Amino acid sequence: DSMSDIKQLLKEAKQELTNRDYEETIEISEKVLKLDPDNYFAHIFLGKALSSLPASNNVSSNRNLERATNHYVSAAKLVPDNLLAWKGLFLLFRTTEVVPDILSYDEYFDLCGQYADALLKQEQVELINDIKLLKKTHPDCQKAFYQHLKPGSLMAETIGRTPQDALLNLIKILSNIETTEIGKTLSQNRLKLKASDPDYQIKLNSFSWEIIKNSEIDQLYNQLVNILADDQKRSEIENQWLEYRIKVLKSMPLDVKKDFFTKVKEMVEDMVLVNHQSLLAWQKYFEWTDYEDLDNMDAPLIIKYFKKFPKDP
- Annotate 227-250 with b (16+ C-beta within 10 A) or e (fewer): bbeeeeebbebbbbbbebbbbbee
Residue 97 is which amino acid? E
Listed as own residue / partner, the contacts of 143-147 with beta carbons closer than 8 Å and 24 or more positions apart are 143/105, 143/170, 143/173, 143/174, 143/177, 144/105, 144/106, 144/108, 144/109, 145/109, 146/170, 146/173, 147/106, 147/109
Q: Are 249 and 261 in contact (CB under 8 A)?
A: yes
CA dihedral 6, 10, 11, 13 (to 10 degrees): 140
Between CA 43 and CA 21 the distance in angstroms is 16
What is the CA 22 to chain-centroid distance, rounded? 38
- CA–CA separation, 19 and 156 (whole Å): 41
Q: How far is CA 200 from CA 16, 179, 197, 206, in A?
A: 72, 19, 6, 10
Helices (H) and strands (E) in the chain, counts: 18, 0
At how many Å resolution was this determined? 3.7
